[PDB]
Amino acid sequence: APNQALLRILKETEFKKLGSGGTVYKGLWIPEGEKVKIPVAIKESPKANKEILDEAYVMASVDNPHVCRLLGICLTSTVQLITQLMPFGCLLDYVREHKDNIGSQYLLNWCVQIAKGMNYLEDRRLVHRDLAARNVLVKTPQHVKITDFGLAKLLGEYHAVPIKWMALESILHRIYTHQSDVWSYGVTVWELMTFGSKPYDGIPASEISSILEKGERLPQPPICTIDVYMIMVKCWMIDADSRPKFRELIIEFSKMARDPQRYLVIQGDMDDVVDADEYL
Ligand SMILES: *CCC(=O)Nc1cc(Nc2nccc(-c3c4n(c5ccccc35)CCCC4)n2)c(OC)cc1N(C)CCN(C)C
């Protein structure tokens, strides 16, 4: 099927410019005419351009409440990616910073929303290849979205990286599927339930392939009942088709979000501004 997505090109004079390592910035996008101010994030060598344009290609082709939307690109010195600003940051830093305030309702609901976004990416025949808690931003504490499609690939499995989030098949053979994304989903859920701990903390990345082959996995988080930990372990099966599907992960965590304290045991449980989701 033809990809009739629209690539929107933005005037640099329509911005009023967060993180470097390229550089991501924050700003306002004021389209000429319409009295409207959109809070945006602006991400500022031939290779780079091919890669930002590949990432821009992917984001322009997805449209889902739990996937980061692309607003457009600006064609200057280096190409800029303009996306919706997510004010609360990435989810990895957020659960670390608010460790003493994350309730089981928020944890289980984020798991539902991430699986919804990943399930949508599967519908678009898209393999994310880099699902992690650092790549999930927070619009509001009640609403998260998946991001960072720099590694994403469109399927017609994929034959080609963060070692501690990828499946054993991805490490041994470089094969990626939606089912290898389920593995990364499992590590991401583990990251949330441990309030931001680092997976396999201390183990260099080179022995990870040996550890997982001999049968070892990530430990059971303290707040996690066996019901939640079982779902994680299922995401880490050797046999990729034995792992759960994102549509099933939605159903399972949905049921748990209706009785959160049964599955997570936690102690003590600017005027014309328009968010990008309302500027269609
Ligand atoms: C987890 C780090 C981070 O995201 N911090 C952050 C982010 C935003 N808002 C926002 N909105 C859309 C996209 C992004 C973003 C950033 N980075 C990437 C990389 C790949 C894809 C998207 C993307 C790299 C790191 C910077 C942002 N970010 C935000 O809104 C005010 C505030 C923050 N924080 C918490 C500041 C970062 N802090 C660690 C100094």
Swiss-Prot record:
Record protein name field: Epidermal growth factor receptor
Result after altering L151M: Found in a lung cancer sample
Gene name as annotated: EGFR
Record: active site: D130 (proton acceptor)
Cell location: Cell membrane; Endoplasmic reticulum membrane; Golgi apparatus membrane; Nucleus membrane
Effect annotated for changing L151R: Found in a lung cancer sample; somatic mutation; constitutively activated enzyme with strongly increased kinase activity; more sensitive to gefitinib than wild-type
Complex and partners: Binding of the ligand triggers homo- and/or heterodimerization of the receptor triggering its autophosphorylation. Heterodimer with ERBB2. Forms a complex with CCDC88A/GIV (via SH2-like regions) and GNAI3 which leads to enhanced EGFR signaling and triggering of cell migration; binding to CCDC88A requires autophosphorylation of the EGFR C-terminal region, and ligand stimulation is required for recruitment of GNAI3 to the complex. Interacts with ERRFI1; inhibits dimerization of the kinase domain and autophosphorylation. Part of a complex with ERBB2 and either PIK3C2A or PIK3C2B.
Sites bearing N6-(2-hydroxyisobutyryl)lysine, chain numbering: K43
UniProt crosslink position (Glycyl lysine isopeptide (Lys-Gly) (interchain with G-Cter in ubiquitin)): K35, K47, K50, K214, K245, K255
Post-translational modification: Phosphorylated on Tyr residues in response to EGF. Dephosphorylation by PTPRJ prevents endocytosis and stabilizes the receptor at the plasma membrane. Dephosphorylated by PTPN1 and PTPN2.
Impact noted for substituting K43 to A/M: Abolishes kinase activity
Site (Important for interaction with PIK3C2B): Y279
Function: Receptor tyrosine kinase binding ligands of the EGF family and activating several signaling cascades to convert extracellular cues into appropriate cellular responses. Known ligands include EGF, TGFA/TGF-alpha, AREG, epigen/EPGN, BTC/betacellulin, epiregulin/EREG and HBEGF/heparin-binding EGF. Ligand binding triggers receptor homo- and/or heterodimerization and autophosphorylation on key cytoplasmic residues. The phosphorylated receptor recruits adapter proteins like GRB2 which in turn activates complex downstream signaling cascades.
Binding-site residues for ATP, renumbered to this chain: L18, G19, S20, G21, G22, T23, V24, K43, T83, Q84, D148
Associated disease: Lung cancer: A common malignancy affecting tissues of the lung. The most common form of lung cancer is non-small cell lung cancer (NSCLC) that can be divided into 3 major histologic subtypes: squamous cell carcinoma, adenocarcinoma, and large cell lung cancer. NSCLC is often diagnosed at an advanced stage and has a poor prognosis.
Outcome reported for the amino acid change (mutating D259A): Strongly reduced phosphorylation
